[PDB]
Design a protein around this ligand. Sequence first.
Ligand SMILES: Nc1ncnc2c1ncn2[C@@H]1O[C@H](COP(=O)(O)OP(=O)(O)O)[C@@H](O)[C@H]1O
Ligand SMILES: [Mg+2]
Ligand SMILES: [Mg+2]
Length: 411
Amino acid sequence: TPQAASPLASWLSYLENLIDLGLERVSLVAARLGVLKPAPFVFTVAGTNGKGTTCRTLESILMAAGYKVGVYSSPHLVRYTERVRVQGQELPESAHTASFAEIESARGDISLTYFEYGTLSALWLFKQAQLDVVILEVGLGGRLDATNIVDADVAVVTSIALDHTDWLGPDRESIGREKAGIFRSEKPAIVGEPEMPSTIADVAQEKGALLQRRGVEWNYSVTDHDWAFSDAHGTLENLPLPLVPQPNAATALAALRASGLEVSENAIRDGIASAILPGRFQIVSESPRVIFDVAHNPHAAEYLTGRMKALPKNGRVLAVIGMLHDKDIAGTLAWLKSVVDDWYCAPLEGPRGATAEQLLEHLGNGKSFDSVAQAWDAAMADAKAEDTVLVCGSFHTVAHVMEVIDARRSG
Ligand SMILES: Nc1ncnc2c1ncn2[C@@H]1O[C@H](COP(=O)(O)OP(=O)(O)O)[C@@H](O)[C@H]1O
Ligand SMILES: [Mg+2]
Ligand SMILES: [Mg+2]
């Protein structure tokens, strides 16, 4: 058993090597720790896709508005510490190991899972920091996610589509019911998904939550160079085109206006203008245009394909791909194949990672490589200045490339 002085790596290894579902055990330990209400105001964000960027937008705006903000996020690209941000920054590794020692002693003989530990740890780090606002990204689903032991002041649903069907149900209706579990009596329930499953309205009714959905209570319009927003409180014009998916920026703005937090129009403009997340349609360079997007399911791949198609009339689209078997590979590739010209396949290490050959079988074309790095090198060697190189398929794939680019800065 590690201690507060142990290196973080020893903690994570200990946490990775570990019954009765339901939030009881995690709730009982959280009660002993007094972290059930991490800040005076909490936003909890659920959804199939766009949770991370909706959270980032909220954080950007609130920081410009002068609030002390904490953000819980998952998963992480490279380092575990990316998961807990305070004022947009990561916390010392020793802060994380101390919180782990605190949870370890507080749990007594109560057993916790990896995500339960990390969630309690984030709640603890936030409490210690004395913040005004805490933004929690749900780990998986809603009703049964560790983040649901906290009662959100504003609950958010970014989108609903298919992913984690093994846990959440086989359809949008069953998935929507689970995600909506984060709703609360008399609290705004912000739904940014344009085709809302009825089960979300059912759950809002069962709880007495205040449902405010895109297309009904609020809406937005776009232009080639800006956008406008509207809700029951009025409208906003000439907003900055976002650097995160357009639907998520509107969702965050809706949740923000519904919170009653005092935020000026200028703090809104500044926050929307600077909100961006590595690996979420990130334009890394030009000539050739390089893009990183961790789209790992059919709904996100369809969104990426729409973005790809909106790009200027180009040359060729080369793609560097690595995927995990626990995702709908065939479904994801079907969409991507509609815009990709040349495929460069690589394996992902471990148990759940697919081999280059497995991806290739789905593609029907392309070259296989020994690693993501070699695939990346090959794509960049072949790419012309008028082309676009896309690194996609998983967080692991985008991370492998960011790390190689970084290490080379040192050569
Ligand atoms: N509203 C959305 N609709 C469709 N796909 C989306 C949306 N938001 C994000 N995505 C896709 O999901 C990927 C990851 O998004 P992310 O912001 O990390 O959301 P999440 O935290 O729920 O995974 C993006 O890189 C993009 O491919
Ligand atoms: Mg996420
Ligand atoms: Mg997920």
